[PDB]
Design a protein around this nucleic acid. Sequence first.
RNA 1: CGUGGAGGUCAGUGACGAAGCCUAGACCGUAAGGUCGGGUCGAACGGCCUCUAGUGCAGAUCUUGGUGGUAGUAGCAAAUAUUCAAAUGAGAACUUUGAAGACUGAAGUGGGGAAAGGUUCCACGUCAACAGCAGUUGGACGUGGGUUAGUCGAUCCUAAGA
RNA 2: GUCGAAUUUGGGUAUAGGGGCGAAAGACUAAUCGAACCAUCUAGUAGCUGGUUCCUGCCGAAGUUUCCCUCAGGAUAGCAG
RNA 3: AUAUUGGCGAGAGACCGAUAGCGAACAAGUACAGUGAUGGAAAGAUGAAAAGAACUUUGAAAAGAGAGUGAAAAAGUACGUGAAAUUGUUGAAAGGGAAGGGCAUUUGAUCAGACA
Lengths: 126, 175, 49, 52, 60
Amino acid sequence: AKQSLDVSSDRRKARKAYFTAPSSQRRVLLSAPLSKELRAQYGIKALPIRRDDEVLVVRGSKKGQEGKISSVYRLKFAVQVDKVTKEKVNGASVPINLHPSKLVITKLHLDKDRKALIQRKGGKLE
Amino acid sequence: ARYGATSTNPAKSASARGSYLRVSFKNTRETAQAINGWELTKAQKYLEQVLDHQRAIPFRRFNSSIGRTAQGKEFGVTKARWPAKSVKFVQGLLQNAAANAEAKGLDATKLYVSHIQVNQAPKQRRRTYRAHGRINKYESSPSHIELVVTEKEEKVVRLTSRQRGRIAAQKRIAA
Amino acid sequence: RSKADRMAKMERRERNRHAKQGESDRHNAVSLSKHLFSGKRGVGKTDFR
Amino acid sequence: SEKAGHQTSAESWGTGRAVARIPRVGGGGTGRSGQGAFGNMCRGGRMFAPTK
Amino acid sequence: QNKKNSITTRTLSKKRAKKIERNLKYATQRKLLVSSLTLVKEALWSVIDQGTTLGGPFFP
RNA sequence: CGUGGAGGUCAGUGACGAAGCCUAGACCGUAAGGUCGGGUCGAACGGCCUCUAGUGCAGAUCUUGGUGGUAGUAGCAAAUAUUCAAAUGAGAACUUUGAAGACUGAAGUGGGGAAAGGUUCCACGUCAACAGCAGUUGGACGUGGGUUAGUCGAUCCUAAGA
RNA sequence: GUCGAAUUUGGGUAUAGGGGCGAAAGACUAAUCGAACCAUCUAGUAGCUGGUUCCUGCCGAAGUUUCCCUCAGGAUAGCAG
RNA sequence: AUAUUGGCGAGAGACCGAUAGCGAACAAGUACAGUGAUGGAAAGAUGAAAAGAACUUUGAAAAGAGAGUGAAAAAGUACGUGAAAUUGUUGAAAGGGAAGGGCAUUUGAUCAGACA
Ligand SMILES: [Mg+2]
Ligand SMILES: [Mg+2]
Ligand SMILES: [Mg+2]
Ligand SMILES: [Mg+2]
Ligand SMILES: [Mg+2]
Ligand SMILES: [Mg+2]
Ligand SMILES: [Mg+2]
Ligand SMILES: [Mg+2]
Ligand SMILES: [Mg+2]
Ligand SMILES: [Mg+2]
Ligand SMILES: [Mg+2]
Ligand SMILES: [Mg+2]
Ligand SMILES: [Mg+2]
Ligand SMILES: [Mg+2]
Ligand SMILES: [Mg+2]
Ligand SMILES: [Mg+2]
Ligand SMILES: [Mg+2]
Ligand SMILES: [Mg+2]
């Protein structure tokens, strides 16, 4: 149960905020959990997804498949993996739209800002 | 898909349809009823003769204040016409059905129109200006046409004890 | 280009059925005309011949 | 709302006009013109005994 | 009748047929208890996964 | 008897199918109605004890929306008038060119403008809708091109007036 | 009918609603004139017309009396619970 | 201390649920009308994902038939469900200037229960 007077439990307001959230908020909304190995290594549970990290599909018809995030399509609330596609007879390949909450991150793309974020969340990398 | 009626054993049948066709619904219904049940080639020749004004389409339902002709005596009617647009649309659908049957590999000489149905498509709503500054409707009544052609292919009785005894007695009396 | 053309042609169908001359034909008819439904004709001057 | 169904400029066409005497929207050039108004039986009108 | 293998208005939809197959599997379980493009891409992925002296010290 | 919402309860019903809808099938009530089967459908819903109301329609020349008979009917009959061949085209009474017959008859069916309209002008492409028949044509649809001033106007002057 | 003037007409300008304008017809004043058009007060006013939504059970009437001068609109007695 | 149908920012309801609720849930004070003051609508729903039907065939073409996508095309940008009025086809039946209804039975069709 909520206790603050500044937070709302209104379903209509919550849905409007979710569907009109800008790109920077959608980055946080599109968070993905780390794997067991990465969780043990870094000491953190979930991170916002980004382009150059490897993921594992743990739900849906494509469960068990692995690959690298081809793109983070924030406009349609999805991420696209290069190895997860749908093929037609005429050679056409269409990316499968995956939600990051249905994935698991197996290898992080590391940079200065990424390490800073991990450390401020409480990470213990290397 | 979803025809008004389908054929059991669909491997010996072919179907054709046309939707939202800008042709008179009443004339098209009369043409389809004049063609219903006929052999395919005979029906096509009849439609060509109708276009040539050698034979006519009998008008049975939508036929109020229609002229009379001698060409209706073949079908035992007095009111018949020659709806060219309806005949052309039905000819197109018949040709498509024959092509479908040929693609399926059916024998073209044994085909007969086993189903044909005309429905009212949504109306095309023009308007006309009339006297005293009025607006009146001016509507086309389009047709949905569908047809299916098909190849032509070639008790325990319980009795009472009295009835059983009577039959036994008759059997004993006879040989 | 062909996909967009098919989309536009499929979208055009309702206005075609309403027999509009185009996207710019947006004539609106009233429900009832008062000059047609305001008639009590006495012995005197009329509104039309 | 206390103004619901009352933000309309409409007047009755009188008796003997071959139509019902409900007030009708004036003006022209739109589908709203000539339609009934203000009545609890009219589409877009005011409800009977509005809640307070 | 289709399992056993004129003009009629009796048709069976694929949705209803699949539901009947699913329900028949449920009933049988209770009774017992009581792509070329993909191949081409895979093949391409698996496939990709002294000497000589001409002329001389002069300008021809 | 029945309807929308509310408190409680049936640890109620439901993707092995909720609600809705259709039904030549079945039952219970004097009745208001209630219940069951089959089909269709695809995500919510009910029994009982109570609370509450924007709670039950055949009518109001009722409102809004939709649809018939009339009916392939009335009609598309003012302005003298059209015809032949070829081309284009899937398709030509209606498009193009040629060959003919006619008309406006200089107070014109000619050549320019004012008000008004605003691209309708012209070229190319092009036919779903519109041109109350048709259409390959169009003032239609799609893409563009085009309006050149010291001397023509405005601009300046004053009129009734403001 | 009239057709060289009390002629026909374009543009500009002036007169605005309990007002204008009128060779006078209560004519005209944007298809509106016995009172222009628009919005608001306003859901204005009813001697009157029309309509007013489920079932069953039981009970079940009233024109017959006195009066406000009499119409109108009211009071009262009676019949039913 | 009091007022607050304007403005800015918040939290809520035994309220309404697309003919309701603001006129407006949508490029709504929009489109459209009027010289002008002003008047003023209609209009939400494929699918989890456009994967929005490649290819063959008939047709001038719109399209049709195969095929295919999809859990489903009894979801084909006319798209959730899909009532009634009204209409087509098929099957059964009645009909000598209306039809419809009530009581009773014949005929045809169809159907439940009780089956120890
Ligand atoms: Mg006649
Ligand atoms: Mg006019
Ligand atoms: Mg309202
Ligand atoms: Mg159900
Ligand atoms: Mg009510
Ligand atoms: Mg009704
Ligand atoms: Mg009644
Ligand atoms: Mg009525
Ligand atoms: Mg006629
Ligand atoms: Mg003439
Ligand atoms: Mg002459
Ligand atoms: Mg002459
Ligand atoms: Mg035409
Ligand atoms: Mg031109
Ligand atoms: Mg143009
Ligand atoms: Mg609304
Ligand atoms: Mg649907
Ligand atoms: Mg029906």
